């Protein structure tokens, strides 16, 4: 969770 909503799979960007 690294600042986006919708696609909840974000390690850095």
């Amino acid at each position: 969770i690294w600042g986006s909503s919708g696609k909840l799979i974000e390690t850095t960007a």
Side-chain angles (χ1 to χ4, degrees):
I1 303 294
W2 270 71
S4 296
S5 188
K7 184 63 67 177
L8 282 72
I9 192 283
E10 288 192 100
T11 311
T12 302

